[PDB]
Amino acid sequence: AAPLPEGVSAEAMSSALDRFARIVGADWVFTEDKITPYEDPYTISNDETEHRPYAAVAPASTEEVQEIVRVANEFGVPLWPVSRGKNFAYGGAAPVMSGTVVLDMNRMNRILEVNEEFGYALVEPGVSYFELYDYIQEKGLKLWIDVPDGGWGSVVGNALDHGIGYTPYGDHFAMQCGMEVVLPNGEVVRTGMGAMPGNNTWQLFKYGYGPYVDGIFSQSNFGVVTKMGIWLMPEPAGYRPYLITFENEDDIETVTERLRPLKVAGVIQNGATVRSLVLDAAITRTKSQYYDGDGPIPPSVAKTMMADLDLGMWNFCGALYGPPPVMDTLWTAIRDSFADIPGVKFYFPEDRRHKVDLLLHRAETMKGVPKLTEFNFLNWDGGGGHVGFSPVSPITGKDAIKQYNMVSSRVREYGFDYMGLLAIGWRDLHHVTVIVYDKTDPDERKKLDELFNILVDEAAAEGYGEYRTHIRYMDRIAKTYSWNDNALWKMHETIKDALDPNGILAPGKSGIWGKNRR
Amino acid sequence: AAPLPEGVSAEAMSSALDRFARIVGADWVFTEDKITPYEDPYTISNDETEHRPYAAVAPASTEEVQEIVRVANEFGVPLWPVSRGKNFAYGGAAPVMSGTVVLDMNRMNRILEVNEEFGYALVEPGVSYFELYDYIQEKGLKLWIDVPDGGWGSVVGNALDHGIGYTPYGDHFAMQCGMEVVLPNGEVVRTGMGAMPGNNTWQLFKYGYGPYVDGIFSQSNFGVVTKMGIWLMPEPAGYRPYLITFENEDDIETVTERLRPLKVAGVIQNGATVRSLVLDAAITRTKSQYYDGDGPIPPSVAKTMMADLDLGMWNFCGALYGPPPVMDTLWTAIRDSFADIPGVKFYFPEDRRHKVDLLLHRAETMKGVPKLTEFNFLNWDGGGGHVGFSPVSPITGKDAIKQYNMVSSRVREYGFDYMGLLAIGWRDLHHVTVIVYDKTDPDERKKLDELFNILVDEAAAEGYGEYRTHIRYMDRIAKTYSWNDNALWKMHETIKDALDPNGILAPGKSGIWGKNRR
Ligand SMILES: Cc1cc2nc3c(=O)[nH]c(=O)nc-3n(C[C@H](O)[C@H](O)[C@H](O)COP(=O)(O)OP(=O)(O)OC[C@H]3O[C@@H](n4cnc5c(N)ncnc54)[C@H](O)[C@@H]3O)c2cc1C
């Protein structure tokens, strides 16, 4: 079973569960066997006392949330809010500290507004990418959404976690506009213009007046977000996805050099993604279809996969947006930036000879169509879980290839296949390492945990820091931001103790604890 | 003279001034007659005990700032930070509360970095738009800056106040990336990746890890910003400014309807500005050159000015950016959106027959060239000060014209000329009212103060709220954001008391006081 959270009497916990049950009704308080949906689905720990949720409560309304939060204060019980809790590779729905009651906000799934003239939506945390896409299609509205690679997750939760997608609206939190928040004391606030009664501008103007605070409720335990606005891209007048491939692994140095001017200037309109061979292949193939051995793939097999699949060692999947004349012009600039590189190949969808193909999968993603089929890389090695590591770096060939060499060697010494991606947002490069592992085998869990720790350690030392991580690694990633004896987190701790003096909101999120657990 | 701030002994103040003088050296502590630079230059109050600064201290370094702040705590003296304090129409350098020691950061004017590959700058608060433009030109770097209408002011201070400009980088705070902050206790923090020692990514990636807090130091008294990064637009491959004019005052309803789709989609790349006749004329003419009477201008004079100056009743000044093919395409969409409106006229600079002309002034602004000559509207009526009122509204003809009728009537009943502007950022319309008044005449001060109060009152009631205001009106503008008995400001007060328990930072900025003055 799961243990009580330290400092919390068994009487006080059962008093809390009863008063929660009055608030949401007895049907919506979960214990015992009902609680396995809220486990980490991709186990990393070998210790079964860690990241174990104790109960779940699922309110219907903002006001029920406040009532819980007030109760949680009275009995000093901690809560762990999830919008839908489909945060795979980050912990799923599970809390950092054991003993935590999960506040599940699935049921709060109303789409309050979708406005076509102004290109926005106002949504509760329960609304998924699938629900929002389907609503938009059904009503015939000319708006695109921006989806991660799995659309069963939360428009809100993903944005609060600094999620990304693959359209020009790829920076989810950046497109957030207006929120309603239940503070850790149980008071309700609205940010920006929503603080102004009678406004029709909540989702039109981010700032409102005075200190801009939306951001303090992202990657945070300073409040529970119960409503959130997000800007939506008007349907454009044109759309052309492409794939550029490169033959050699060393190609990533010059390729990254040429993306810099294109990205900084905005000639490329979405995030640029340059994916390694195995990461792309694993969408439509598995390792055992190409190699017998338990080890990572030898070079000769890599060549086979390249020739079969029409993929390079690096694969740049992008998309043009806008009227055909603009697209033609941007394409001339993009293509010309890469033409002189030996081995380079350029494809539009018509030129892909396979009808089950990387480019045809990612054409859907790059126009905001949510889909299940990215999760296919999970099957590369017979079926397991994934871990991601995605630190930030300057957009430089030299930083690109250093990260590639550093990571690929260690991943491969550990017997995993190198699956990596060079992503660029706007001025920021991320080298994303994804490691598929057997979540059911404790010997591979020990291996993966150690590998992850080392990668983080070696990346930080070169200046590369993580921006989003798994519940398990939250403290570790916090300790990377340590300038002036951890001055930043001390300020976080100061705000935490002011908004949450009893520390009853997600103790340990982003490595923020509060005075009682510190 | 100026009075001591309430609650502060005369001994304690002179102890503070001495220990400040040890910190920055005696040359850099200002009293008595040295203190008139830091008065409000555009007097609104008739009471000479209000917004009166008591002393000024001008440190050299971040560490001097911290020392002051620690001293300020010991003796409970309040500080009012200005970067350069050239905040005209908002109070200049003056504090809301009297008695406040001005912390002047002019001397901290080093440009720490300008990076061409990555399109950013790292600047101290003392750096003006003029200094940054001149540095960029001198070193030959292909970067544009984004300037307000007066470039003698602070890249930092303007961004912290939510300032705007007229290029695609018009949203200044939005382009902010990374800051160093001295907290009200005197500790120093860096946000985002700057918290990570050895980073080369401080100005490349906004968020870093965990709660995003940059925004809490804008329009705020939660800290003193001592360094700040800002993204800079790479020099584009082309640039074509334009002016579209319209004959009738009612034209602003359809004009605003057609801008909506263009702005939401981003076809117009900079903020759209549609300026009333007098606001544009006053750049190159004065009232007395057209009309004798003390009143506002009659219609017959308006017609004269239109025919002389080749200006309409509304004037849409915009600019295309990028390679000629993209510009041609965007122009076709823009022009076609307006062609069917009776009286419409379209001009590029070549088609302006005057060599001292609105379009040739604003061509400079819309490519990031700082210039003095906007301040010319100040001379319309013989020379005075300005007040601005710029609330937010949905991008709607109906909201545009309601605001026009509401404001123009009252401004004109009060004997001022209607000078207004319809601006659009991205999804946000602002009706900006600018009122030029005689700052030296107390009867016109009473009039302007009353008018301003009424405008605010009538605009709020229709859903339109102010986002930036004069020191004098800060409390009033705060009280507009009152949903749930002022729940938002109560949270601001909570964070204020946690970061600033002794309340020694800009008491009253954005209507935030702290527990000792509340
Ligand atoms: C194969 C694979 C591919 C993926 N691809 C992508 C991708 O392309 N892009 C991407 O962004 N992600 C991606 N992810 C991660 C994940 O799938 C999505 O980000 C997912 O949408 C997040 O889960 P969710 O939306 O349910 O958010 P939630 O689980 O609801 O929220 C995530 C976290 O945010 C916090 N939180 C949530 N709601 C609130 C609230 N109301 N108040 C306060 N805090 C709150 C909590 O701490 C929670 O743990 C991928 C994962 C896998 C395994």
Ligand SMILES: Cc1cc2nc3c(=O)[nH]c(=O)nc-3n(C[C@H](O)[C@H](O)[C@H](O)COP(=O)(O)OP(=O)(O)OC[C@H]3O[C@@H](n4cnc5c(N)ncnc54)[C@H](O)[C@@H]3O)c2cc1C
């Ligand atoms: C005719 C006219 C035209 C104008 N046109 C424009 C325009 O086009 N666009 C525009 O944006 N503005 C415009 N303004 C307003 C003003 O000219 C500029 O915004 C100006 O640059 C702001 O003053 P500053 O840059 O010195 O900032 P400061 O005076 O240094 O700062 C403004 C405020 O920010 C806060 N602050 C400053 N530095 C710090 C710090 N380090 N830490 C904490 N708080 C701090 C303070 O409360 C200060 O009062 C105009 C004004 C006039 C009169």
